[PDB]
Design a protein around this ligand. Sequence first.
Ligand SMILES: *[C@@H](C)[C@H]1/C(=C/c2[nH]c(/C=C3N=C(/C=C4\NC(=O)C(CC)=C4C)C(C)=C\3CCC(=O)O)c(CCC(=O)O)c2C)NC(=O)[C@@H]1C
Ligand SMILES: *[C@@H](C)[C@H]1/C(=C/c2[nH]c(/C=C3N=C(/C=C4\NC(=O)C(CC)=C4C)C(C)=C\3CCC(=O)O)c(CCC(=O)O)c2C)NC(=O)[C@@H]1C
Length: 133
Amino acid sequence: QRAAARLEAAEKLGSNHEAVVKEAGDACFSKYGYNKNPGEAGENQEKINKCYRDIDHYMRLINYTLVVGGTGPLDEWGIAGAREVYRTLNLPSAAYIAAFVFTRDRLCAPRDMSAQAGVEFCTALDYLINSLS
Ligand SMILES: *[C@@H](C)[C@H]1/C(=C/c2[nH]c(/C=C3N=C(/C=C4\NC(=O)C(CC)=C4C)C(C)=C\3CCC(=O)O)c(CCC(=O)O)c2C)NC(=O)[C@@H]1C
Ligand SMILES: *[C@@H](C)[C@H]1/C(=C/c2[nH]c(/C=C3N=C(/C=C4\NC(=O)C(CC)=C4C)C(C)=C\3CCC(=O)O)c(CCC(=O)O)c2C)NC(=O)[C@@H]1C
């Protein structure tokens, strides 16, 4: 009666995330090509190599969100305490939000998923964009 909407999306993301996560990655370091700089967020392939894990992680908990229904998994396992431990590491908040809008911008209904499926695929990416600010 409702599930199908969220369901389809999660599966869609499920079978194709490494291509959407990586996609976001490159774009993330496009708006902030200064992170590459020496002594910066992804200066070296080990701090830029793992930063990609953080993208699969946020999208990881989204498959789980649109399956249990709400933003339950995403929450505790990535909504608060993750953000001001970045403050501890000096991992900018605007950098994390750079992957999201791109992810949310790229969608398409006839080509990538569906009409109703998408507006909720963008509901948990925006639910995260808002949480990071
Ligand atoms: C409508 C938004 C605009 C449009 C889109 C467009 N998308 C691609 C290619 C990709 N975009 C995606 C996005 C996803 N794939 C998924 O399965 C999911 C589910 C989580 C999403 C939202 C990805 C990863 C790609 C690369 C792989 C692929 O071809 O599927 C293109 C191809 C050209 C390009 O990369 O720019 C296009 C045409 N076209 C417009 O210009 C629209 C306004
Ligand atoms: C691009 C987006 C940014 C980037 C990221 C970056 N990540 C870290 C360190 C951590 N990021 C996470 C994220 C999670 N860990 C979790 O446990 C969860 C929730 C279950 C998630 C989603 C965490 C917690 C850490 C820290 C501790 C650890 O080593 O595991 C780093 C490295 C840190 C350092 O002090 O060297 C990086 C590089 N880097 C960028 O360029 C961006 C701004």
